[PDB]
Amino acid sequence: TTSQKHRDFVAEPMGEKPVGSLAGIGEVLGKKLEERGFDKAYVVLGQFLVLKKDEDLFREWLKDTCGANAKQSRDCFGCLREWCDAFL
Template structure:
């Protein structure tokens, strides 16, 4: 069952949301991503799209960029994939 954070994220425009609003990304990982100049949710989406929505490539980027564990990688990947499906990308 999807978390409330996932449901909310999927059903709303990304707009100018802070990166910590992305499922799988909280304050700690958000701070790490911000160090890499990824401070907004749309920048995570851009990384997802630049990797052709490929699960392994995106998860590897997350692990290398912010040390996301497997669960965090999975939650973030699923959020990006589901958001794209919901919004026709």
């Protein structure tokens, strides 16, 4: 199942949307991603793509980088995978 945040994100190009528009990325995670340079959603897309869309490696990277739990990293991965299927 999906959140509305997910559906909103996968429905359109992300442009300069902030990192907090990604499903799973709330205020606390977003702050920590911004602190480490990932201020916009497309920067996280960048990492997803450098990692060749690998679910295990991306979700681990997200845990290591901002402390995302399993649900948060699942939600974020799925929203980027579905965005890519639609637009990349």
